[PDB]
């Protein structure tokens, strides 16, 4: 192997990183931060996203694994058998591309991307595959990956989607939905190659969040959403619906 | 080629049909009520659903086309050169419903729903043989992707582009108190996932498949999964789904 | 005063009924199921609804009391283990009357119904919704539900309605699965109406409707109009304590 | 009578303002306050005259799409100049107290959000804990405010003659840790809803168009105000028609 480990950086988390590196030392396993084929996240789903956002350019040859103190398969007490089996089953999840135009900037998301007004009222035209769909006025829009559907998407009333489905899901944040600004209400699930284009009507300043990161963009001409060609790969040793059950039902 | 046309039965639908067959008489095409290669539906989505359910056993070599006189009917009463046009075949996913007691199976193009016969509806929802929730409410709805714009939408479900191979489960008026608790959210499942509804007290259920509703007694299990079978559409032009949605709900 | 007791019919309730009757015998209390001044329901919110509907025509001359074994519900303040002191308190005639608003449903062909929780209408279901004689929306869907305030905690809640403090005099209209498209544009939101507002449902094509009033659902043929309004009549509760509606909400749902 | 006119400040409103004046002007003690523009303009005039709400009747003209406080069309300004030379209708208001004490009056609503990071609050009704809420925030609306942000959040529309307040959730988290009622809640007069911090004590508190950051808050208290707002009414335009015209269709315009 070539591998590496990220850690949340607290008390318990650093030790497992040291133990596992020491555990991998007994095997044909080489540590490297530059070209890992295996990335191990130790901490939480919040920790996993930083590991993902660190290796956006090597999503093509990396399988990720999470250790939890929805992306973490193992518990800390199972780390040692993880090292051995890992010394000895890849599944891919879809990702979301966000393009902002002003030189265009592009972002990749594992959970979602959201758009709000800079401070005034948020009003944009929603254009799907070059055809106008609605003129939205409200708090904002949230575009989610399938894996992201259990997060903010869920709070906005979106559908929970099995992460094997290649799609992106759009949810409204507080639409006014009156006869001037008539909107669909329902979440919309898009297949690959569909482009959702957000076009401003008056104000051009927007707070755009991509996973944890929120950035103010000035003088936006367009925000474009589509399912990415890139995918994230997990090393698997996965009952999505039971995890849903354990997290929400109880 | 061998074909047939259905009509809702009002004035214009029956009239436009004969206009179409007479036009089909000018070409190498044979009318045939038992073994069509092409089925033309004249009326509305309800008429379309009936046409689909009339030919459920020959879905693999039928291309469907719908004309609407007032989401499945792309064509307007442009009909005659459509005859002249009569090209690519397009496929939509379908929903398999199996009820166990001799088990019965049904195919849906829009959705299947389950309600109690009378009184409280309570069911255990088992996903891939693992218990997920105990649902209490009015009922549950399992929708195809093309069915997502129909009853599913009114229940708060997501609208899905119909090329996505999935099924979507929505709740009807869930009761959410101190020890009935459900996910609330709509759930979208891929192929090969099986959702099993298993009775808790009552065993009689009103089961909906598209426009048909049937009472079943002594139900052991209701099983939902995406069907291996698909329905094929005859497509001639650009009519995109999202514009159809905009046309139906936004305008 | 004159009183009566209904029982859900299980042995524990019938026995509690017999003991209370004997307990009222030590006081100036007369049992009478025909002209009671006090109606005591033993069982559940369902038992209470039947007690309510048994005496709809004497609501101005009754104070109601509910006794429930475990989960109190929203209409029962008393647990059976407190029956003794309730006999004592009720015999003395402390208590104060608190009133809840009710819902009048009028069906025209004309029949009228009183609801304590809600009335619903079902069929294809298509109706014109007319508020205070002005057209408001043309609805297509599964049906409509109009609830009282005390009814907001039941079916109304399951349809997305707001929970309302039962001291507020209103009725609330919720949609059941509106299609809400360009042919049938509807408000979506629950609507809360004061007294003297009239909501009229007028058919457009089919004229037969399944109409529910609390439990009871009746098939009405050839309906010309369904009218909803806050009733002039109220249901009165005999209350001995400060009735904490939000704590019951918490205990039933949280 | 003593009067004055506010304007949104654009072309048509400023001119219509000057034009109506041509048709005693007094900025300090008006008996009639006229708002020209939109509901946002109406809100500014209301908050401009909070200390004389008992001796003012408000009236609004809408310069664009129909509003809920600005009922009058610009083409009627003249029938209004003639009309004004009427009776009062009063709507309930919402009192917000922030304790660390600052108090606010709202005509539409007050919302509470976290400044940054997770919004978690204990919700206390009439001195008794009711729920622990986690989400984006909470909104408490007046009756007339139910047609504004409240509606977008799934709240009920309430006829504004009902004396109440309505609490809605903004993007609630409902999992194994945090369970909330979900449903909107409508409270009568004299009920107090207290939002109490759990960890963070910094909150974005909005009152109508104003949004305010408070550091180290101890408590946010909501109750229906004893104060009322009075609209000068000359003709029949019912609330449900305003609702219909704004959200359903407006066939005649």
Catalytic residue among A14, A45, A130, A211: A45
Determine the Cα–Cα distance for residues C226 and C120; give it in Å rounded to an integer. 10
Determine the Cα–Cα distance for residues B206 and B217; give it in Å rounded to an integer. 9
Query: Tokens representing A215?
Result: 């950035």
CATH number, domain A95-229 = 2.60.200.30
Three-state DSSP at B152 gives: helix
Pick from C45, C211, C226: nearest CA to C127: C226
Determine the Cα–Cα distance for residues D42 and D36; give it in Å rounded to an integer. 7
User: From the centroid of its chain, how far is CA D49?
Assistant: 14
CATH number, domain B1-93+229-251 = 3.40.50.10330
Determine the Cα–Cα distance for residues A96 and A232; give it in Å rounded to an integer. 11
Contact A250 D176 (CB under 8 A): yes
Burial zone of A45 (CB within 10 Å; 0-12 exposed, 13-18 middle, 19+ buried): middle
Helix (H) or strand (E) holding B24: helix B11-24
Torsion-angle region of A46 (φ positive above 0: left; ψ -120 to 50: alpha; else: beta): alpha
Determine the Cα–Cα distance for residues C173 and C191; give it in Å rounded to an integer. 5
Query: What superfamily would CATH give domain C1-101+233-254?
Result: Probable inorganic polyphosphate/atp-NAD kinase; domain 1 (3.40.50.10330)
Query: Tokens representing A30?
Result: 């080489």
The DSSP 8-state label assigned to residue D161 in this structure reads: T
Pick from D75, D77, D79, D10: nearest CA to D38: D10
Where does CATH 2.60.200.30 sit in chain D?
Answer: 93-226
Binding residues of A for NAD(+): 45-46, 111-112, 137, 139, 147, 150-155, 212
Determine the Cα–Cα distance for residues B174 and B164; give it in Å rounded to an integer. 27
Nearest to D126 among C162, C170, C246 (CB): C246
Closest residue on chain B to D182 (Cα) = B176
Helix (H) or strand (E) holding B245: helix B241-245
Determine the Cα–Cα distance for residues D216 and D32; give it in Å rounded to an integer. 40
Burial zone of B25 (CB within 10 Å; 0-12 exposed, 13-18 middle, 19+ buried): exposed
Phi, psi (rounded to 5 degrees) for D49: -125, 35
Query: Tokens representing B81?
Result: 């050169």
Q: Which partners does chain A have (≥3 C-beta pairs < 8 Å)?
A: B, C, D
Burial zone of A135 (CB within 10 Å; 0-12 exposed, 13-18 middle, 19+ buried): middle
Which residues of chain B neighbour D182 with C-beta distances below 8 Å? 176, 184
How far is CA A215 from each of CA C50, C58, D10, rounded to the nearest angstrom? Answer: 60, 66, 32
Closest residue on chain B to C155 (Cα) = B173
Query: What superfamily would CATH give domain B94-228?
Result: Probable inorganic polyphosphate/atp-NAD kinase; domain 2 (2.60.200.30)
Mutate to test the interface with D, among C149, C161, C164 (most CBs of D within 10 A): C164
Resolution (A): 2.1
Closest residue on chain A to B244 (Cα) = A133
Task: Say if residues C103 and C174 touch (Cβ distance below 8 Å).
Answer: no
Determine the Cα–Cα distance for residues C192 and D162; give it in Å rounded to an integer. 9
Determine the Cα–Cα distance for residues B134 and B132; give it in Å rounded to an integer. 7
Task: Say if residues C163 and D184 touch (Cβ distance below 8 Å).
Answer: yes
Determine the Cα–Cα distance for residues B4 and B196; give it in Å rounded to an integer. 38
Distance in Å, alpha carbon of D77 to nearest chain A alpha carbon: 24
Q: Is B45 a catalytic residue?
A: yes
Catalytic residue among B45, B74, B204, B218: B45
Which residues of chain B neighbour C189 with C-beta distances below 8 Å? none
Determine the Cα–Cα distance for residues C6 and B60; give it in Å rounded to an integer. 64
Where does CATH 3.40.50.10330 sit in chain C?
Answer: 1-101+233-254
Three-state DSSP at B130 gives: strand
Distance in Å, alpha carbon of D69 to nearest chain B alpha carbon: 27
What lies within 8 Å, CB to CB, of C5 at 6+ separation is C17, C20, C21, C31, C39, C40, C41, C42
How far is CA D87 from each of CA B186, D83, D234, D236, rounded to the nearest angstrom? Answer: 50, 12, 7, 12
Residue that is written with structure tokens 């409508």 in the block: D186
Residue that is written with structure tokens 């599944």 in the block: A91
Pick from C126, C156, C155: nearest CA to C141: C126
CATH number, domain D93-226 = 2.60.200.30
Name the fold adopted by A1-94+230-250: Rossmann fold (3.40.50)
Task: Say if residues D5 and D15 touch (Cβ distance below 8 Å).
Answer: no
Q: Which partners does chain C have (≥3 C-beta pairs < 8 Å)?
A: A, B, D
Q: How many CB atoms lie within 10 A of CB B226?
A: 22
Q: How many CB atoms lie within 10 A of CB C97?
A: 12
Task: Say if residues C180 and C166 touch (Cβ distance below 8 Å).
Answer: no
Strand residues in chain C grouped as ranges (E): 2-7, 30-31, 38-43, 63-68, 96-108, 111-115, 118-122, 125-131, 134-141, 143-147, 163-164, 170-176, 191-194, 199-203, 209-213, 216-220, 225-239
Residue that is written with structure tokens 């946010």 in the block: D220
The DSSP 8-state label assigned to residue D72 in this structure reads: B
Taken as a whole, chain A contains a residue count of 250
Bridge partners of D137?
Answer: D113, D170
Nearest to D185 among C160, C162, C194 (CB): C162
A51 CB-side CA count, 13 A: 32
Q: Does domain C102-232 have CATH number 2.60.200.30?
A: yes
Phi, psi (rounded to 5 degrees) for A9: 100, 5
Task: Say if residues C226 and C209 touch (Cβ distance below 8 Å).
Answer: yes
Determine the Cα–Cα distance for residues D72 and D82; give it in Å rounded to an integer. 14
Phi, psi (rounded to 5 degrees) for C180: 40, 70
Strand D203-207 with D210-214, pairing: antiparallel
Determine the Cα–Cα distance for residues B135 and C230; give it in Å rounded to an integer. 33
**Torsion sign, CA atoms D74, D76, D82, D85:** negative
Which residues of chain A neighbour D176 with C-beta distances below 8 Å? 246-250
Torsion-angle region of D150 (φ positive above 0: left; ψ -120 to 50: alpha; else: beta): alpha
Residue that is written with structure tokens 């009033």 in the block: C213
Where does CATH 2.60.200.30 sit in chain B?
Answer: 94-228
Query: Tokens representing D76?
Result: 């009627």
Phi, psi (rounded to 5 degrees) for C87: -55, -45
Residue that is written with structure tokens 């089953």 in the block: A89
Q: Solved how? A: X-ray
Contact C168 D179 (CB under 8 A): no
A200 CB-side CA count, 13 A: 23
Phi, psi (rounded to 5 degrees) for C214: 55, -125
Where does CATH 2.60.200.30 sit in chain C?
Answer: 102-232
Determine the Cα–Cα distance for residues C100 and C16; give it in Å rounded to an integer. 27
Task: Say if residues C227 and C54 touch (Cβ distance below 8 Å).
Answer: no
């Amino acid at each position: 192997m070539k591998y590496m480990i990220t850690s949340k950086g607290d008390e318990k988390s650093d030790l497992l990183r040291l133990n596992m590196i020491a555990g991998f030392g007994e095997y044909d396993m080489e540590y490297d931060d530059v070209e890992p084929e295996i990335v191990i996240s130790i901490g939480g789903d919040g920790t996993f996203l930083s590991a993902f956002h660190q290796y956006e350019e090597r999503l093509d040859e990396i399988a990720f694994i999470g250790i939890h103190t929805f992306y973490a398969d193992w518990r800390p007490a199972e780390a040692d058998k993880l090292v051995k089996l890992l010394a000895k089953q890849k599944v891919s999840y879809a990702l979301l591309k966000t393009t902002v135009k002003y030189k265009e900037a592009t972002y990749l998301a594992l959970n979602e991307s959201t758009v709000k007004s800079s401070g005034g009222p948020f009003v944009v035209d929603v254009v799907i595959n070059d055809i106008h769909f609605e003129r939205f006025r409200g708090d904002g829009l949230c575009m989610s990956t399938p894996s992201g559907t259990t997060a903010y998407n869920k709070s906005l009333g979106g559908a929970l989607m099995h992460p094997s489905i290649e799609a992106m899901q759009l949810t409204e944040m507080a639409s006014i939905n009156n006869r001037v600004y008539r909107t669909i209400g329902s979440p919309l699930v898009f297949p690959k190659h569909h482009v959702v284009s957000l076009q401003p009507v008056n104000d051009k300043d927007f707070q755009i969040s991509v996973d944890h990161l929120s950035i103010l963009h000035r003088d936006v001409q367009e925000i474009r959403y589509e399912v990415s060609a890139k995918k994230i790969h997990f090393a698997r040793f996965f009952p999505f619906w039971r995890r849903v059950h354990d997290s929400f039902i109880e």
